[PDB]
Amino acid sequence: PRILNSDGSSNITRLGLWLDDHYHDLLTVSWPVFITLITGLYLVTNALFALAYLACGDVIENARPGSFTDAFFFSVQTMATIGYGKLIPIGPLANTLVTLEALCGMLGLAVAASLIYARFTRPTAGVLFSSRMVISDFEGKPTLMMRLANLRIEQIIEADVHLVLVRSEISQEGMVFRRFHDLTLTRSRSPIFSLSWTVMHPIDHHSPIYGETDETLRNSHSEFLVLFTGHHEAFAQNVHARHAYSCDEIIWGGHFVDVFTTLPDGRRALDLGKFHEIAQHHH
Amino acid sequence: PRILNSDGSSNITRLGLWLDDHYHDLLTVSWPVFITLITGLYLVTNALFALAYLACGDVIENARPGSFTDAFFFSVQTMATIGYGKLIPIGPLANTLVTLEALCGMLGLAVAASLIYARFTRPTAGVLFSSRMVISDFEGKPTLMMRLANLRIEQIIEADVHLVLVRSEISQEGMVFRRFHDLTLTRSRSPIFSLSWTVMHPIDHHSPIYGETDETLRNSHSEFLVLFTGHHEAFAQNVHARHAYSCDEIIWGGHFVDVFTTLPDGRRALDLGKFHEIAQHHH
Amino acid sequence: PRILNSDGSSNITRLGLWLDDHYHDLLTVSWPVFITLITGLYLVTNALFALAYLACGDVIENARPGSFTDAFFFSVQTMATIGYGKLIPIGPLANTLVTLEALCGMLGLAVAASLIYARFTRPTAGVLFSSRMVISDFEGKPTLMMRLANLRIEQIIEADVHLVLVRSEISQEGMVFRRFHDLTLTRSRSPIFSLSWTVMHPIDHHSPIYGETDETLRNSHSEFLVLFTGHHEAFAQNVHARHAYSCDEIIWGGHFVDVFTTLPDGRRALDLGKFHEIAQHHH
Amino acid sequence: PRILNSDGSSNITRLGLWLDDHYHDLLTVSWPVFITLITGLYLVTNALFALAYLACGDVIENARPGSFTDAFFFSVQTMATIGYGKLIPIGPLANTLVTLEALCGMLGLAVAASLIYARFTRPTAGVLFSSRMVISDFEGKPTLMMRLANLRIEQIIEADVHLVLVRSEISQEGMVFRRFHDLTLTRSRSPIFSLSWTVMHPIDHHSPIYGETDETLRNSHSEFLVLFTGHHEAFAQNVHARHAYSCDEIIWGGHFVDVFTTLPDGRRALDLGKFHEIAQHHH
Ligand SMILES: O=C(O)CCP(=O)(CCC(=O)O)CCC(=O)O
Ligand SMILES: O=C(O)CCP(=O)(CCC(=O)O)CCC(=O)O
Ligand SMILES: O=C(O)CCP(=O)(CCC(=O)O)CCC(=O)O
Ligand SMILES: O=C(O)CCP(=O)(CCC(=O)O)CCC(=O)O
Ligand SMILES: [Ba+2]
Ligand SMILES: [Cl-]
Ligand SMILES: [Cl-]
Ligand SMILES: [Cl-]
Ligand SMILES: [Cl-]
Ligand SMILES: [K+]
Ligand SMILES: [K+]
Ligand SMILES: [K+]
Ligand SMILES: [K+]
Ligand SMILES: [K+]
Ligand SMILES: [K+]
Ligand SMILES: [K+]
Ligand SMILES: [K+]
Ligand SMILES: [K+]
Ligand SMILES: [K+]
Ligand SMILES: [K+]
Ligand SMILES: [K+]
Ligand SMILES: [K+]
Ligand SMILES: [K+]
Ligand SMILES: [K+]
């Protein structure tokens, strides 16, 4: 049973212990729920203004006396600023409510637009993670690797990547705990991430997985979390993506197949058809 | 008497020495004050336009001659763009004012929406701090610790934490002063803060509190300030939270109770009911 | 054939393998396409509301019975909240649709404004790159250099620069690959970039181009990518710019001509007429 | 003649060499110019729509035939969506223009609001710089110092400061140039800047001003630039401030007067009346 899922979310059960987090919740409910809440508030406030006009008397021209329906639709036409001109206010009180309601309609528009824009400007990174990792020799050292691909044509600026080991350990005091290790990489920063990036942790005598095997990684229930971040040109915003691997998803001795190549007519090409392809020696 | 309160604010009295900081003040006044200011400006500018129309003569059809009331509500219906159609402008001057007022109504909407959105997009971190710190042995060293919990389901990216000692000191010149020490941590950066994070300062021979006791920390009026920051997924914005501890809130020999556990049916769980629980040996 | 073009884009052919990336695409299509899409949606939704009213019967006063045209323009006048007052709704159903349509008109405005603002707030850096690099002796070492100029009067805060070597290499395992080297600079950070900045990589015995010649750089198909980033005062936003050089664009022995000078009357001046000027000794 | 002014701007004369930078210029022109440009565009586009209606014939009810004035104000009432109801469109062509104009009015509102909000959300840091620097002994070393004060009640998160020496130098090749040195500080980062911060560069044997005097600093025309940056709580935005000092503004042997004190009744206080006060020994 894996703790981190492939998408980087955790299976940990949160035991725990309406408006406690309202701004957050307005941004994170589904769009159908969000639009329902806006609509609900919009209908509720029109009904309240409708009652306000009735409480003043018959102050709506061409409205049936005592009709909530006519007062409601006049409220709509006032708050939305349609102002057809058949239902119009009569007297100081009605005209004062109109002045207040028009302000409420404008303020409600500002609020709704603010929330919509805050929901919109949360772009995704558009990054693809290799389905597996590998451990194989590179530049004289066994090296843990995975790789990333850009699925968009715009580039990502000052891109950072982390390979994070999560495992259970024992302190010299005998205390058992899970902790994370942000592994040392050959490249942790790419000034411009463009097409594809192979992320590499050389396993030298300082690596937390130095001397480890498939068996000893499972014994410590080791998992690997990958975080990618950068400033995406398409949005002028920071983006981030995550992924996680289990011990079952490390190919010991594996070598990623090159995705960069030179076509027969000479021009260099990227072939993401090979992105998840890994070569192994079969004995 | 503590200088820093538990929430990270200071009790220092600012001795010191209307529109001096207007943008800042518009964003930091309470919402009732903010809405009152918008409403006030909205009513003031309609009155000024009302006087403008009267200064042109009887240029509002169906308006009583010389009536400020009728000119005021016509101004409202024009600036808010309701345009019921009973009060309408007559002649070039009135129609020019309408053209200007409609622009003012649209610009005022843009301004109000800009301020509302700037007030909205200041999210809180949703982080909980342990009510105490502890000092106890971990990995062979006495270690100062506190911990954090995420109260939301979304994660925080590239999370940073600081444990800051603030105390009074004496230079070799004999000058007395208070300064801060950003303490060295075992982990200062969590690429993905998800559920709970124990922040640890090992007290080695380079620590500014090496050899210190409860007595000597009080003698220097030592306090501890914690800053958490990170990029919150729910908002695509950086968030931050702070907390402070006094010497009374350090449990020497204390050990935090585990909040992570494995339920009987095997699945891993987080129990924040234990978040503030600390174990001590009683002699 | 260069891989990186002068503007920092790559000539690599992306082999590969409607609403799959809709938010991104709405922000990156050309403005004519964007406005066409907004207009299209705006006309489509008015037609749908027009059919809605007709499906209710003859519920639009002064509208010809069964006329899609009259129902369409009444829908426009309702969604845009013009409300001339000739075409008005009749009965509960029509007035309910008006209430829904006004909400749709306001929500569509919020959506369009959110997208327009997200497209707008992606400012350019306003930085000029020297058309060439040079390698010449400075402070006792052969040093690779290029330079930047600010084309605006506002300054750029916490400016970072990278000189990135990209070349083909061979590992001791015999694997061939292209990788990047973020070269060590004398100054990688300028707290305030104001007018012009000469970026320098001293070629010491640790430099990846130590001992290299024009010939050996071409043999490894070496290219140089420059990234500039910083917080632009004019926008209160991070900006970035990029540029790339080939081996043909390095002047060995070249010295940039000073762009800073003191005018005859004593005041210091910047002369960007000399920005691309390089001096060479001719033997 | 100083190059950097006290406010951090430079006196360097930019020799050099309508819509070349339009987005930048819309955000940086004065507010009167900005509002004039919006108004101008608003009047120009209404005139063009007015001509459009006239080109269709007498398609505006209650409008005088051939009157540009009546067509202009009908355009205003349509683009602003006032729709009084006296001037109304007649026929397919006029009603099509209305549909287009309403869209233009909504798009123009989105554009204006986007620009206004981009102009608004550029907050100032609210930081005060000491009018002078000092050089005096601290913790066994001559130390260059200045200090900062927060003029607001909200705090600044992850605050960074730079003390930057700018001076003219000579390389071993004999080349003369001005360069900057970002000086090593005792504290360059304050996790929470709250009230006042004394910034200190210890002048040890590695300092670029080690062994320097008032005379030798003037000979190299040395100036000192200070940059402050941080995440301001009031805005949830990064802010920055700058200041510069000349050799005339360094008090050799000076000691800043404490701004923190304990009032007679015991509570700690900040007295910014002393912020610019410096003590000197008079011989
Ligand atoms: O790390 C990798 O796997 C690729 C490094 P590059 O510099 C190789 C480019 C080529 O072979 O043509 C690509 C870096 C990037 O696209 O971001
Ligand atoms: O530092 C801690 O107290 C927890 C470290 P983790 O890696 C432990 C996870 C587990 O025991 O299942 C949790 C890190 C996080 O949630 O951000
Ligand atoms: O690196 C350069 O080429 C210029 C360094 P500066 O400090 C020279 C200023 C002068 O000669 O007057 C300019 C730095 C900047 O404008 O950002
Ligand atoms: O650097 C300074 O001059 C002040 C350091 P502090 O920690 C002194 C606080 C006191 O004396 O009460 C203040 C730091 C801050 O306000 O940001
Ligand atoms: Ba309207
Ligand atoms: Cl740890
Ligand atoms: Cl200090
Ligand atoms: Cl690499
Ligand atoms: Cl330099
Ligand atoms: K409206
Ligand atoms: K209207
Ligand atoms: K009307
Ligand atoms: K409105
Ligand atoms: K924003
Ligand atoms: K309006
Ligand atoms: K409006
Ligand atoms: K932003
Ligand atoms: K509208
Ligand atoms: K109307
Ligand atoms: K009418
Ligand atoms: K509207
Ligand atoms: K708006
Ligand atoms: K409008
Ligand atoms: K509008």
Taking contacts as CB-CB distances below 8 angstroms, the residues of chain C near D177 are 258
Query: Cα–Cα distance between C59 and C65 in angstroms, integer?
Result: 9
C-alpha span between D73 and B21 (Å, rounded): 39
Closest chain B residue to the Cα of A102, Cα to Cα:
B80
User: CB under 8 Å to B257, separation ≥6 — which residues?
Assistant: B274, B277, B278, B279
Which amino acid does the sequence have at A142? P
| Contact criterion met (CB below 8 Å) for B220 and B209 | no
| Angstrom distance (rounded) from CA C239 to CA C271 | 24
Tell me the two tokens of residue A226. Answer: 């990958």
b/e per residue, D240-278, with b = 16+ CB within 10 A? bbbbbbbbebbbeebbbebbeeeeeeeebebbbebbbbb
Structure tokens of C208? 């990846």
Nearest by CB to residue B227, choosing from D109, D123, D192, is D192
Contacts of D109 (CB under 8 A, 6+ apart): B106, B109, B110, C109, C113
DSSP 8-state secondary structure symbol assigned to residue C64: P
Tokens of D246: 């000349």
Nearest to D237 among C152, C187, C236 (CB): C236
**Nearest Cα residue to B81 out of D97, D103, D77:** D77
Assigned token pair, B191: 């690429």
Spell out the residues 6+ positions from residue D245 whose beta carbon is closer than 8 angstroms to its own: D6, D132, D133, D146, D223, D224, D226
Nearest protein Cα to ligand 2, atom 11: A178
Which residues lie across from C179 on neighbouring strands? C167
Domains of chain C and CATH, by start: 20-123 (1.10.287.70), 124-283 (2.60.40.1400)
Nearest to C255 by CA among B243, D14, A194, D173: D173
CA-CA distance, C223 to C209, in Å (whole number)? 11
The tokens describing B277, both together, are: 């629980």
CB B122 within 8 A of CB B134: no
> In angstroms, rounded to a whole number, what is the distance separating the alpha carbons of residues B208 and B216?
12
What is the distance between the alpha carbons of residues A144 and A199, in angstroms, rounded to a whole number? Answer: 8
Alpha carbon distance, N-terminus to C-terminus of chain D: 30
Show residues of chain B in contact with C81, CB under 8 Å. 81
- Token pair, residue B118, equals 């700037």
Q: Which atom of ligand 1 is nearest to the CA of A147?
A: 3
Task: Give D157→chain B minimum CA distance, Å.
Answer: 8
Pick the closest to residue C24 from C126, C125, C122 (CA basis).
Answer: C122
Residue B57: both structure tokens together: 């003569």
**Closest by Cβ to D116, choosing from B10, B110, B182:** B110
Say which residue the tokens 């589904």 belong to: A30
- DSSP conformational letter for C272: G
Q: What is the DSSP letter of C273?
A: G
Resolution given for this structure, in angstroms: 2.0
**Angle of CA points C189, C193, C199, to nearest 5°:** 55
**Minimal C-alpha gap between B147 and chain D (Å):** 18
SS3 C261: strand
Residue type, B142: P
Question: Ligand 8 centroid vs C208 CA: distance in angstroms?
Answer: 13
D152 C-beta closer than 6 A to ligand 3 = no
* C-beta of C195 in contact with ligand 3 (< 6 A): yes
Ligand nearest to the CA of D62: 20
DSSP element (H, E) containing C24? helix C22-28
Task: Write a three-state SS string for chain A.
Answer: CCCECCCCCECCEECCCCCCCHHHHHHHCCHHHHHHHHHHHHHHHHHHHHHHHHHHCCCEECCCCCCHHHHHHHHHHHHCCCCCCCCEECHHHHHHHHHHHHHHHHHHHHHHHHHHHHHHCCCCCCEEECCCEEEEEECCEEEEEEEEEECCCCCEEEEEEEEEEEEEEECCCCCEEEEEEECCCCCCEEEEECCEEEEEEECCCCCCCCCCCHHHHHHCCCEEEEEEEEEECCCCEEEEEEEEECHHHEEECCEECCCEEECCCCCEEECHHHCCCEECCCC
What distance in Å separates the CA atoms of residue B128 and residue C134, rounded to the nearest whole number? 55
DSSP state of C258: P
* C-alpha span between A27 and B67 (Å, rounded): 47
Select from A2, A21, A42 the least CA-distant residue to A245: A2
Cβ <8 Å between B23 and D236: no
**Hey, what are D130's tokens?**
């000491």
Q: Closest Cα to residue C235, out of D119, B238, D8?
A: D119
Q: For residue D154, give Cα distances in angstroms to B217, C184, D125.
A: 28, 39, 11
- Cα–Cα distance, A80 to C82 (Å, whole number): 10
> What phi and psi values does residue B282 have, to the nearest 5 degrees?
-100, 120
**Residue type present at position C232:** H
Helix, strand, or coil (residue C268): strand
Bridge partners of B141?
Answer: B138
Cα B6–Cα B9–Cα B14 angle in degrees, nearest 5: 140
* Secondary structure string (H, E, C) spanning chain B: CCCECCCCCECCEECCCCCCCHHHHHHHCCHHHHHHHHHHHHHHHHHHHHHHHHHHCCCEECCCCCCHHHHHHHHHHHHCCCCCCCCEECHHHHHHHHHHHHHHHHHHHHHHHHHHHHHHCCCCCCEEECCCEEEEEECCEEEEEEEEEECCCCCEEEEEEEEEEEEEEECCCCCEEEEEEECCCCCCEEEEECCEEEEEEECCCCCCCCCCCHHHHHHCCCEEEEEEEEEECCCCEEEEEEEEECHHHEEECCEECCCEEECCCCCEEECHHHCCCEECCCC
Task: State if residue D210 touches ligand 3 by the CB under 6 angstroms criterion.
Answer: no
| Chains touching B (3+ CB pairs < 8 Å) | A, C, D
Number of B to D CB contacts under 8 A, please give it. Answer: 158
Q: Which long-range contacts (CB under 8 A, 24 or more apart) does C8-13 make?
A: C8/A192, C8/C225, C8/C226, C8/C227, C8/C242, C8/C243, C8/C244, C10/A194, C10/A195, C11/A267, C11/A268, C12/A195, C12/A260, C12/A267, C12/A268, C12/A269, C12/A270, C13/A263, C13/A267, C13/A268, C13/A269, C13/A270
Q: What is the distance between the alpha carbons of residues D252 and D215, in angstroms, rounded to a whole number?
A: 12
Q: Which amino acid is at B255?
A: H
Kindly give, in sequence order, each residue whose CB lies less than 8 Å from that of residue B32, ignoring residues fewer than 6 positions away.
none
Q: Is A56 exposed, middle or buried (0-12, 13-18, 19+ CB in 10 A)?
A: middle
Contacts of C81 in chain A (CB under 8 A): 80-82
Asked whether B71 and B53 are in contact (CB, 8 A), the reply is yes
> CB atoms < 10 A from the CB of A22, how many?
9
The two structure tokens encoding residue A52: 């306000």
* Contact assessment for residue C28 and residue C39, using Cβ atoms and an 8 Å cutoff: no
Neighbours of D31 (CB within 10 A): 9
DSSP C67: -
> In the numeric block, which tokens belong to residue C151?
């084309």
Strand, helix or coil for residue C224: strand
Ligand 23 centroid from CA A200, angstroms? 56
> In C29-165, which ranges are continuous DSSP H helix?
31-56, 68-79, 91-120
Helix A91-120 × helix B68-79 angle, to 10°: 20
Q: Contact at 8 Å (CB) between B268 and A12?
A: yes
Match 């014939």 to its residue by tokens: D57
State the number of CA atoms in the 13 A half-sphere of C142 facing the CB.
17
d(CA A231, CA A154): 11
Q: Are C124 and C203 in contact (CB under 8 A)?
A: no
Alpha-carbon distance of B83 to C134, in angstroms, equals 68
Q: What tokens does B76 get? A: 């409202």
- Concatenated DSSP letters of chain D: --SB-TTS-B--EE-----TTHHHHHHHS-HHHHHHHHHHHHHHHHHHHHHHHHHH-S-EETSPTT-HHHHHHHHHHHHTT---SSSEE-HHHHHHHHHHHHHHHHHHHHHHHHHHHHHHS-----EEE-S-EEEEEETTEEEEEEEEEE-SSS-EEEEEEEEEEEEEEE-TT--EEEEEEE---S-SEEEEE-SEEEEEEE--TTSTTTT--HHHHHHTT-EEEEEEEEEETTTTEEEEEEEEE-GGGEEET-EEPP-EEE-TTS-EEE-GGGTT-EE----
* C34 DSSP 8-state letter: H
Determine the distance from the C-alpha atom of residue C239 to the mean position of all C-alpha atoms in its chain, rounded to a whole number: 8
Which residue, among C184, C182, C224, has the nearest Cα to C206 in the 3D structure? C184
- Separation between Cα atoms, residue C259 and residue C273, nearest integer Å: 8
Return the closest-CA partner of residue D180 out of C192, A6, A145, C165.
Answer: C192
Which residues in chain D touch residue A85, judged by CB atoms under 8 angstroms apart? Answer: 84-85
d(CA A38, CA A33) in angstroms, rounded, equals: 9
Q: Is C23 helix (H, G, I), strand (E, B) or coil?
A: helix
* Closest alpha carbon to C222 in C283, C171, C164, C269: C164
Angstrom distance (rounded) from CA D36 to CA D25: 14
Q: Say yes or no for a CB contact (<8 Å) between B272 and A28.
A: no
Burial-class residue C61 by CB neighbours within 10 Å (0-12, 13-18, 19+): middle
Ramachandran area for residue A276 (φ above 0: left; ψ -120 to 50: alpha; else beta)? alpha
D76/D49 Cα distance (integer angstroms): 9
Q: Collapse the DSSP code of C83 into the 3-class scheme (helix H, G, I; strand E, B; otherwise coil) and give the result.
A: coil
CA-wise closest residue to D145 among D183, D191, D115, D179: D183
Are β-strands D255-256 and D223-232 bridged in parallel, bridged antiparallel, or unpaired?
A: unpaired
CB contact (8 A) between residue A192 and residue C8: yes
* C95: Cα within 13 Å, side-chain hemisphere: 15
A 10 A CB-CB count for C114 gives 22
Which tokens is D206 given?
């590695």
Closest CA to B59 of B48, B75, B82, B44: B75
CB C199 within 8 A of CB C146: yes
SS3 C78: helix
With beta carbons under 8 A apart, name residues in chain B contacting C112: none
Residues lining ion ligand 9 (Cβ < 5 A) are: C 186-187; D 179
What is the DSSP annotation of C157-223?
Answer: EEEEEEEEEEEEEE-TT--EEEEEEE---S-SEEEEE-SEEEEEEE--TTSTTTT--HHHHHHTT-E
Best B38, B46, B82, B190 member to test A by mutation, with max A CBs in 10 Å, is B82
Which of C91, C53, C98 shows the shortest CA–CA distance to C72? Answer: C53
d(CA D139, CA A228): 43
Q: What single-letter amino acid sits at A160?
A: D
Residue nearest to atom 5 of ligand 1 (CA): C179
Tokens standing for residue A18: 């309406």
Q: Taking a C-beta distance cutoff of 8 angstroms, is the pair C58, C64 a contact?
A: no
| Alpha-carbon gap, residue C28 to D115, rounded angstroms | 19
- Which bound ligand lies closest to the C-alpha atom of B107? 16
CA dist., res. C50 & res. C71, Å (int):
5
Whether B227 and D73 lie within 8 Å, measured CB to CB: no
C21 phi and psi, to 5 degrees?
-150, 55
What SS3 class is residue C45? Answer: helix
- Atom 4 of ligand 2, residue of closest alpha carbon: B197
B147: which 2 tokens?
């911990």
Distance CA C151, CA D183 (A): 28
Tokens of A194: 């463009």
**How far from each other are the two terminal CA atoms of chain C, in whole angstroms?**
30
**Sequence-separated (6 or more) residues with CB below 8 Å from residue A254:** A132, A134, A135, A136, A278, A279, A280
